[PDB]
Design a protein around this ligand. Structure first.
Ligand code: HEM
Ligand code: HEM
Ligand SMILES: C1CNCN2CNCCNCN(CN1)CNCCNC2
Ligand SMILES: [Cl-]
Ligand SMILES: [Co+2]
Lengths: 447, 454
């Protein structure tokens, strides 16, 4: 009835608890101590962190709660604008872009992207085939090279050529620095930060706008999201996306997809390395199914156990670990916690995924077999892709890409944990295993 | 590309007379021992291929290539189970509709609601055995069937068959068992329109009418009463398919009720019986199981949470399903032309039958000790290769009742071990009777009460 609350720091209330490298991990520990719900206060604001499937299923009721922009999303909005991920549900451009882009992201639409995903996957596999005996792989670094290049090519027929470099494409440099500035503002001479922030925004916009105008003037048609956006009309308003919003969407697809998908691949590879029984089943499937020198769309869909490995990695370490909601009207949560219109909730996805009343007593174990029967998972128990109409539009893209790439990696190599790597989870706006490195031993299967 | 072996033929009847035996599944297991992982089986008008290796069965379980087929047995059972979940094709509207409506009634969560009524019947079983005199013994499969039928009747439609109050079953049960028997016997009939069978046909129709009359009455009583229980019937009357917002019609509801009794009672009863048989043959396993039951079941009746902690008991049950899966076969058809195992080309529509007891004896999976009863094999699901263990079928057409069956069997086996030591007073020799399911015929024991009150 009265909600618990963690330790306070006088006038700063709970705010200094987030003054740390690893705030989500700090909140998970607080949730272990305090339970399914706790209040978090800061000067001028309040939120309530939810961890149980019991309360989170109510929060996922779209008639009672809508998406809120966290402070991080509000800062990212300075360069992602009113793109899909940083727009409010009630802004005209949210519904417009949603209606226009949903058909570009369906399971069916992945057939058109497949060839370009394969282009980048092959580049990754060739890079690793070409290492010398003495060398190792930096896993999150190479996964990020891959996911960025894949979203560039499928998104706007643009090659970042990340496997040709040590210093990224200037675009990527600016984007990563902008994200970093957005994140750093969350807990704050800064005139130089501000000048840099503006320059990085100008870099991102100049590139993207040029491409859009080149494509518009050329009239050429590709198998990309940019083409669908230029041809697309919203049935409701009858309008296409304006050129500016198109550019916010392109920036959005890079920011929203690349880092989360890269983290997923990295965690999956980490967990496979720690669970040889799971690795054996995954690798067997990859060998049996991927019988051609490059994978087909239909073959990726047959990688069922690989998909289960990916879902279990998202269970333990959902790479976009939180989403925020507000109460549409006065309402009572769980029969116990009255909320007023406008009150904020935050869903702690890693804690949801550790609800023992749902998953049983072995919640920290890596066991893909939990996902063997998709029907056995209760509704709202597993939410790595958010909720409802504001769920991840890129879900099918992310999973097709990760399934393809993890399948090819297992097909072509055995991986060795040559450093006895200790998991260290770095937090940006997403989660990834920092410093994860492996050595590969080629199975010598040609492409 | 190889040519598959085929067992001996009988002219016009092809391989059909091989199934004209008391124990057809056991006969097929012996054929599989002789011929290997795959063999063709022909009968007038039909062909199937029996699979026995995990190597081939993992491909057969690919839902993109193969879908559920109704075996000839399922086709005959469909005369009384209609388009209930077990006898419907995946592409019939009522399959997906009933599946969507009923899945929430069968979840691990939903078992909390059934627990009390499962306990009601389990207590009756325990009291029966506490009340035997010194001279007497237990008929195990008979008492397990009394239990499983009564449990599904009470949890399924708030109806008491009162099987522990009788020698001759409820008329419903008599008809159902006789219908199943007729369905089974038609499978081996070389001359099904011989006049000899006109009485079989008349009897079959009467038994169908008995089943339908009872069930339809209950449905209409409940509909007119408006009363709400903790049962499957209530969920079916209230339930709306999320896609369409439509409920099941009254007739399909009656097929589903007939289906739950047929599909759950016999298999679960067999599982309990085999588990008890194996515990009696493996004293070291019995000791661990009984130790767990005594340590976990600390109250006079078990709670839901306690049953979930009976982990070794659950492993015992999985190992019993390994050696003697009580629904021993399922059938598939090829969705399109495809090649099985890199060696056997199949055409669209071609049939496969998975011989589950033989899958479960694949030495390349389980090792050289495959005939030994070792529950410890199930300690880590990740160590088991894909599709090696299929007692509940496959994919979207897997057993909807799996959690129900295992909760019930875990509860009841836990209580039996808590309350009694069992004696193999006859040195019983395993004899496996075949209906459409498997059970140990004539298994009897004597119980010695531990005198622990309920
Ligand atoms: C494993 C990979 C991914 C994860 C875990 C993930 C997770 C999420 C989550 C949790 C949200 C909801 C955020 C909120 O409520 O505030 C979301 C939204 C979104 N994601 Fe992803 N995502 C992934 C990959 C991708 C990819 C590859 C793309 C694009 C190609 C993408 C584009 C988006 C967009 C546009 C939204 C906003 C949708 C809307 O509100 O209309 N994501 N994602
Ligand atoms: C140890 C006990 C049990 C075993 C071994 C077992 C086994 C199976 C198998 C192998 C199938 C698939 C059949 C096929 O592919 O043709 C199946 C389906 C089914 N079982 Fe069970 N079962 C058991 C208990 C139960 C119980 C207790 C219920 C109901 C309360 C039940 C209801 C069903 C239903 C309705 C289907 C059809 C599901 C569908 O296709 O949508 N079973 N069972
Ligand atoms: C026609 C040939 N009948 C010869 N006999 C043996 N056939 C066994 C299978 N019978 C099924 N059909 C079809 N068989 C017709 N039954 C006729 C009686 N069987 C005699
Ligand atoms: Cl005939
Ligand atoms: Co004949």
């Amino acid at each position: 009835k009265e909600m618990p609350q963690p330790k306070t720091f006088g006038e700063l209330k709970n705010l200094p608890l987030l003054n740390t490298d690893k705030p989500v991990q700090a909140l998970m520990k607080i949730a272990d101590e305090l339970g399914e719900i706790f209040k978090f206060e800061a000067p001028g604001r309040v939120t309530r962190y939810l961890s149980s499937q019991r309360l989170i299923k109510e929060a996922c009721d779209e008639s009672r709660f809508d998406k809120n922009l966290s402070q991080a999303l509000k800062f990212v909005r300075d360069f992602a604008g009113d793109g899909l991920a940083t727009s409010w549900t009630h802004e005209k451009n949210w519904k417009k872009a949603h209606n226009i882009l949903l058909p570009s992201f369906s399971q069916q639409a992945m057939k058109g992207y497949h060839a370009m995903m394969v282009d980048i996957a092959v580049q990754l596999v060739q890079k690793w085939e070409r290492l010398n005996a003495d060398e190792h792989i930096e896993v999150p670094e190479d996964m990020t090279r891959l996911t960025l290049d894949t979203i560039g090519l499928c998104g706007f027929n643009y090659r970042f050529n990340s496997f040709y470099r040590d210093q990224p494409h200037p675009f990527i440099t600016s984007m990563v620095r902008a994200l970093d500035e957005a994140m750093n503002k969350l807990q704050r001479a800064y005139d130089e930060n501000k000048r840099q922030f503006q320059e990085d925004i100008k870099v991102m916009n100049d590139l993207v706008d040029k491409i859009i105008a080149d494509r518009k003037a050329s009239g050429e048609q590709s198998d990309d999201l940019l083409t669908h956006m230029l041809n697309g009309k919203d049935p409701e308003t009858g309008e296409p996306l304006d050129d500016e919003n198109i550019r916010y969407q392109i920036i959005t697809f890079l920011i929203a997809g690349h880092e989360t998908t890269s983290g997923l691949l990295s965690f999956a590879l980490y967990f496979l390395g720690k669970n040889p029984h799971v690795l054996q089943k995954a690798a067997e499937e990859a060998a049996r199914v991927l019988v051609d020198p490059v994978p087909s769309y239909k073959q990726v869909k047959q990688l069922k156990y690989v998909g289960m490995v990916l879902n279990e990695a998202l269970r333990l370490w959902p790479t976009a670990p939180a989403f925020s909601l507000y109460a549409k009207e006065d309402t009572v949560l769980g029969g116990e916690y009255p909320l007023e219109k406008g009150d904020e909730l935050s869903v702690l996805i890693p804690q949801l995924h550790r609800d023992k009343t749902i998953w049983g007593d072995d919640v920290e174990e890596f066991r893909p077999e939990r996902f063997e029967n998709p029907s056995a998972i209760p509704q709202h128990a597993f939410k790595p892709f958010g909720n409802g109409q504001r769920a991840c539009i890129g879900q099918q893209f992310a999973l097709h890409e990760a399934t393809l790439v993890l399948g090819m990696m297992l097909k072509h190599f055995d991986f060795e944990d040559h450093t006895n790597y200790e998991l260290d989870i770095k937090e940006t706006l997403t989660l990834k295993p920092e410093g994860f490195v492996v050595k590969a031993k080629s199975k010598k299967i040609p492409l």
